Nucleic acid binder design. Sequence first.
DNA 1: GCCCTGGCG
DNA 2: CGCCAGGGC
Length: 159
Amino acid sequence: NELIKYAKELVRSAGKTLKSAAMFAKVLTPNDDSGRHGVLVPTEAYSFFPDMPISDPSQNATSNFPAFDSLSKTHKTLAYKYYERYPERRITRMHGLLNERNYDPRLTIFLFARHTDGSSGYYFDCANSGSGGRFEVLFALCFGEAISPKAGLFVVRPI
DNA sequence: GCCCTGGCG
DNA sequence: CGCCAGGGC
């Protein structure tokens, strides 16, 4: 299974071994980027991310969460933003690869894994369609070979 | 780098 | 909702 091999490889790159995992993968829309606009989180994907209490829906809120950045192979802190005026939620502080706009389509993959040692954690990977890019291979693993990539398209599902 | 807030169909 | 947009520091 090419998706399971990928997920296991991503966890092992952080020095853990995968017990189980969930994935949220999103083909970005042109407005999305690393954080000036962030990656907009579809409502159906809120439950994939950590609980962020919104104590007052009339006020902005913000949470951090740790995530292993696959491109840099280092642990990072992402920001999970609630902006009340829309209302909507964004991820920001992602890898700067996402800022380059001339190589669409772009993909983000988030993986939440339970580890065999009883720990758990988030993982992030991303890609575009430029020369040497990884969009096609990653899109095929997350979504299959039969469906068309489409800006905004996303999947949330167990591994 | 990441903040925040204007807007649209 | 899903998405477009842009100035501040």
